[PDB]
Structures are given as structure tokens and as C-alpha cells.
Design a protein around this ligand. Structure first.
Ligand code: PLP
Ligand code: PLP
Ligand code: MG
Ligand code: MG
Ligand code: NA
Ligand code: NA
Ligand code: NA
Ligand code: NA
Lengths: 381, 381
């Protein structure tokens, strides 16, 4: 249940060697998150929604743990391919596919697809003649998902075009707090499954999507073990027959990555001090824009705190990260730490203003980790 | 006064060879924009604010026309450096600088800097001991610019630290419609310049920044030749003595680039049809988010039009580009054209969902341009 968190001392030593900004990712935490899911939701096979974090070391580890991968483009398939993951470990789960992506699915023998529209059926059919498809249905909690009444018709239309109608999928939405939606959506899919059998169509797989929460600036309301055991139980209650899958994205790596950034300018105009950092809204803090997210920031200061503004290194007036944030006095060259940074962060970073992408350093390859290990082998036994 | 615009026929031929999405940039239009500025604002030397569009061919052409470059990071300096632009053609105009950027300015002999804070003075002083600095003042039309009363004190403090106090700069804000702000800001700087001379400080350079407008979805209200001649005149009226500079960004390349994107999915659910394109809010249409911008889209349809929704290829529900847009019926594989796409577009694109960055094709290297040239040499003489 710990979030991966560098101590102040670890930030000092790392920053002596590696110029800021940089990200630090713990493979151990990614392993722990995966195993925790497998323990509390044993009925659900895992399609890592790699769109959240595609770091190759992270992908190699999950592949090694037996995870499967949800891929949304040619590029996601391509990077998996260079790590020796085969198309049989993938689902092309973008409901609307481009030419490049259909080619790649064909070339790497990807054989599972999701879809939510009639227009999609011929693209898939031509590209991958015999192919398992799941229909995506729109559940409650716009752009994606077929209305629940179209669902059986879309699967039948898919069989008439020579594709194998394998099942149903859905996604409750990202950062879900309550299990209700998961259980509502499981019922909605239950109805459809019955209606299908009697219709002379036998559906074998259910994909319940992602949405498992991660802690943000205010932390986490939910207990995840319960949440997962609950939904696991109501899977058992409803789908004894059926092969069920989940597509975690945010959950897998969100609590496994920290950002380390230096203060590079101060603006003590008053009333409120502005601290300018070396990572900004055009880099890792892009999730403020695209993910409506608020990240936990840690300032390492002795003095009393005061309302402070943080901004990014760019020349754009939009590059403001925090306002009215209670912070001690910082000076140029101080490090701040941002935790819970592994998801929908570096995947939307840019080279706006010519800045370099912040690199991801694998913590387990560093002496700070060796130091944690020697500290742990002494105290625990 | 023409915007660069591919005909329907040009889109067909290009799309036969180059898979969508891709961007098409006309060097001739970039030349025409530069020369137009030099003609109507002859008093202002040009620091191309490359943050808007850093395409190397575009930079090589401007360098060749004698433009200078406004650079905001190490990476912007680095790419200029590989094109053989020397540090003497650059201004490091980011008011708050990182370590990498000060190193690079030192290594490439960049000798002009802007700043707006006291904390910045020692960074600059250590890094580039003898160095021209301009103080940035905050004008009217938050994050950047010193209050007008601090300005002379910041320049004096900069001289006490061994830097050469060269002048003042400002920026009215992006996409300016009226010349007032330019002329207000020119007066504010005039006062400061007088106050400085009598203070035993002689200021040699004025930098009036950017903000010259580009046409958007609704077009352009302003006449640019007038706007520029006006501001040129009021420079002549106010600054006979002084070396003046401008920092166009958006203006230089905005009207010189088109995006070509294919329709890859349809959603005729009703009432409104959704057209899913292969370029999205995580790519070129990122300016919708970071630049509050609305781009002109051209659908090439015979049939009557109807309110339509456009979205992007990603799996995120935020990836919606237009709503209620009057469009003819499109089918999968149609091309749409987006004009006025050269600024603050590809510079904020990402590889979210593993999509590839849309590439920039130089129009003048293509047979479509040869075809335009043979058509023009016949008709005109
Ligand atoms: C099909 C699918 N599954 C899972 C996810 C990831 O969901 P989350 O990151 O909220 O768990 C996405 C991305 O939004 C997706 O498109
Ligand atoms: C110093 C400076 N000049 C010019 C510009 C570009 O202005 P615009 O693109 O609105 O002309 C910028 C970027 O916002 C900048 O920071
Ligand atoms: Mg980029
Ligand atoms: Mg990226
Ligand atoms: Na391998
Ligand atoms: Na924490
Ligand atoms: Na060269
Ligand atoms: Na036009």
C-alpha cells in the first residue's frame, strides 16, 4: 500500500548526477501493483493499457509477469514488437483504426479488436479476415461506445462479414471512485450475454476496462483491495462461464514514478512569491490540461509556509502550475519532488520552446536503491 | 496577401504518395511574410521567435534572408547551431534561464539576453560576464515582465554586476488586433529611455516583441500593411536614435502551412454525424488547448452541409475538435484540409497513444509546386 517516494536525501544524490528535470520510475512498484491486482481480482486477465506509460523497461517487466497489452496504434504495437511481445498478447482496443494500425495488426498477427460502429466492420474484415472482435457499449458514470440496443446488431453484422463475435467491452471512465458503475455495467453486459445465447450467438469474453483510481494531490478516498474484491465477487456471481479481462492504465504505473525538478527562478514581487520550475505544462505537467489532474508537490523547506505560485520554464503565459500553494521559502537550485507522476504525464510531454523531454531513470539500476536494499537487509530478518 | 492553400487536386495527388496525417509548408510564403515585414516595418530588425515553428528548412531560409533568431532554450540554440547560425545572430529571450541554457549561450557565444527579475542577474553575470541585457517590462492589452518602476533599478543592478545594460523589451501579447498597445508600450519605453539618459545610463536597443496577428477560422479583421506602417511611423516619431527589433513568431509561418488529414471513422448515430480524423488534439490540434485557437477546416463536399462533430484518433474523450460544424457528408478515406496551421501546432504535438508526429513536407520540393510553376510561367508574362 505504499506509494513510491524518494526521500529528500535520495533527491540530493540523484540530482548531483542527473540534471533536472528527470523522472524516476520504480519497477518494484510496477510489479507490486500488478501482483496486487492479480491477488484481489484473480478472475480478471490484464491488458496493460500502455497509453498511460509506455516505458520499455516497464513493458518488458509486465510482459515477463504474463500481462497482456492493450494497444491503440501502430506505434504501440511496434514498440511491443521490438521487446519480443507477440501479436497474440495484444488487443487493438482503439474502437476506430487507421490504415497503418490495421497493417501492423495484420503484420504482427494481432487477432483481437474492439469496435463501436458499423463503419468499422469492413475495415477490420478486409484487414484481418478471421478475427475476434468485442463490441464496445456505452455505460454510465459520448465519443466512444455503441448504444446498448445496437450492440447485438453490431455483433451479428460483424459475423455476416466473417469476423468472430467474441464478446462485449466497456469503460466506466478514468479515475473511478465507486464500484457501482463497474457492477451496473457488469449487469448491462449480463443481459446482452443472455439475449445473445438465445439468439444463436455464444459470447466467450468480457472486457471491463480500466478506471481504477490513483492518489492525487488530495490523496485517495477509496480502499482498492475491497473495491477489487467486490468487483471480483460480482464477476463470480454474474460470470461463472466467462473469460473476463481488465485494462488498467493509470493504476499500473501512476504511483510508481516521481518527478524531480529544480527551482530556476524566483519572483518575490509580493504579495505572493512565484517559483519558476524547470518542468512545465508543456512537459510532464501537461496532465493539468488533458487529464484535469492535480499532482502532489513536495518542497523540502524548514521555514513556515506561505501561499505561493508555481510556473514552468516556458515563455507562454499559460505555463502556470499551482496557485495559492502553501510553500516554504525556496531559492534557485532547490529541488522539489512530485509524486504519483507515472500516468498521462510524460506521454503528453512536448519539446515546446526546444526543451528536451524529461528522461525516465530506472530506480532499481541506481545506488540509492542499493542503499535502500542494504538498509532493508539489516533491519528486517 | 494570399494564404498558402492547397487546391483539392493537390490534396489528392499528395495523399496518393504520403500517408495522412501530414503537414505541408511553403518556403515561398515564409519568404513572402518575411519580406512583407521588412517592407512595411523597415525600422525593425527581425528576431524570428522560433518557438512558433522550428522546421529546419524554415530556419535555414530565414537565416539566409538575414533574419536573427530569438531562442528560448538550449535545444533551440542547438538546432540553430547545426544549421551554421552563430550565437551573434541570437537573443536568449526567455526571461528565466536554466543551467543547460546558460551553458549553451556560453558555448555558442550568445551575447544578448532578456530578463525581468533581480534573481536572474547573477545567473547571467557568472555565465556570460560581459553581456548585453534588455529588461523586459510588463505592458497592457502576469508571469513575465518587471513592473515599469523596477525597470531602471534592474538595469543599474545589472551594470553593478558587470553586464552591459543595452535596453528595454516588451510583448503586447499574442494575436494582437489593434496597434494601440504597440504605441502605448512604445511611449512607456520612451519615458524610461529619457529617465535613463539623464541617469547617466545610455540605452541603445528597443525590442517591441511579437503579437502580429494571423487569420483564424473566422479570418482576419486587421490590415497588416497599415498596422505595420503605423507602428513603423510611431517608431520613427519616437525613436530616431534607437536600434529597434521585433520578435514575430506566429506571423512568420502561420499562413504558410496546411494540415492534410483523412477521415478514418464515421458515427452516423444522429442527430449529428461524428467524423473521426487521423490528426487530433494530442497532435497538431493541440493549439485548441494551449493557444485557445480555432483553425479553418475545409471538407471538399458536393452535398448540402449539416451540423457535424469532428474528433481525433485517440482513446481519450477530450479528443474532440469541432462541434456543430457545417459539413457535407464525408466517408472514410476522404481528405479534409486545415489551413493557417504553421504556428503553435506541431510544436505542441505528442506521441500520445503511440501515434507518430505528423511530418512537415516542403511544398517546393514537390511536383505539385512544379505544376504550379508551369501553370504560372504560361499564363503570366
Ligand atoms: C480501452 C481503454 N482501456 C483502458 C484505458 C485506461 O484507463 P485508465 O487509465 O483510466 O485506467 C483507456 C484510456 O483511456 C482505454 O481507451
Ligand atoms: C519573447 C517572445 N517574443 C515573441 C513571441 C512570439 O509571439 P507571437 O507568436 O504571438 O508573435 C514569444 C512567445 O510567446 C516570446 O516569448
Ligand atoms: Mg514536440
Ligand atoms: Mg510524447
Ligand atoms: Na527481445
Ligand atoms: Na506521497
Ligand atoms: Na551548415
Ligand atoms: Na483559407
Amino acid at each position: 500500500m505504499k506509494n513510491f517516494r524518494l526521500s529528500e536525501k535520495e533527491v540530493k544524490t540523484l540530482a548531483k548526477r542527473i540534471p533536472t528535470p528527470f523522472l524516476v520510475a520504480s519497477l518494484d512498484k510496477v510489479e507490486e501493483n500488478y501482483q496486487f491486482m492479480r491477488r484481489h481480482l484473480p478472475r480478471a486477465g490484464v491488458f496493460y493499457a500502455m497509453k498511460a506509460n509506455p516505458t520499455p523497461e516497464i513493458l518488458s517487466l509486465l510482459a515477463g509477469l504474463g500481462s497482456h497489452f492493450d494497444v491503440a496504434s501502430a506505434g504501440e504495437m511496434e514498440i511491443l514488437h521490438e521487446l519480443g511481445v507477440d501479436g497474440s498478447q495484444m488487443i487493438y482496443a482503439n474502437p476506430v483504426k487507421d490504415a497503418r494500425g490495421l497493417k501492423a495488426a495484420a503484420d504482427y498477427n494481432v487477432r483481437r479488436f474492439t469496435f463501436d460502429d458499423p463503419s468499422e466492420i469492413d475495415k477490420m474484415a478486409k484487414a484481418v479476415p478471421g478475427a475476434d472482435v468485442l463490441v464496445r457499449i456505452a455505460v454510465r458514470n459520448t465519443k466512444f461506445g455503441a448504444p446498448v440496443e445496437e450492440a447485438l446488431d453490431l455483433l451479428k453484422a460483424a459475423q455476416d462479414a466473417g469476423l468472430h463475435a467474441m464478446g462485449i467491452c466497456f469503460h466506466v471512465g478514468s479515475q473511478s471512485l465507486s464500484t457501482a458503475a463497474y457492477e451496473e455495467a457488469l449487469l448491462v453486459a449480463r443481459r446482452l450475454f443472455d439475449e445473445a445465447e438465445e439468439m444463436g450467438m455464444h459470447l466467450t469474453d468480457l472486457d471491463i476496462g480500466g478506471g481504477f483510481p490513483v492518489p492525487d494531490a488530495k490523496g485517495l478516498n477509496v480502499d482498492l483491495a475491497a473495491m477489487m474484491e467486490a468487483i471480483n465477487k460480482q464477476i463470480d456471481r454474474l460470470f461463472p462461464d466467462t473469460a473476463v479481462w481488465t485494462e488498467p492504465g493509470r493504476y499500473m504505473c501512476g504511483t510508481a514514478v516521481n518527478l524531480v525538478t529544480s527551482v530556476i527562478g524566483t519572483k518575490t514581487r509580493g504579495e505572493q512569491p512565484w517559483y519558476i520550475l524547470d518542468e512545465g505544462i508543456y512537459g510532464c505537467f501537461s496532465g493539468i490540461m488533458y487529464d484535469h489532474w492535480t499532482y502532489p508537490l513536495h518542497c523540502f523547506g524548514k521555514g513556515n509556509k506561505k501561499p505561493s505560485t508555481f510556473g514552468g520554464p516556458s515563455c507562454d503565459g499559460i505555463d502556470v502550475l499551482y496557485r495559492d500553494f502553501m510553500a516554504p521559502e525556496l531559492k534557485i537550485g532547490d529541488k522539489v519532488l512530485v509524486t504519483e507522476m507515472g500516468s498521462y504525464t510524460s506521454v503528453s510531454a512536448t519539446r515546446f520552446n526546444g526543451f528536451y523531454l524529461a528522461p525516465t531513470i530506472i530506480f532499481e539500476d541506481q545506488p540509492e536503491y542499493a542503499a535502500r536494499l542494504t538498509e532493508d537487509d539489516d533491519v528486517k530478518k
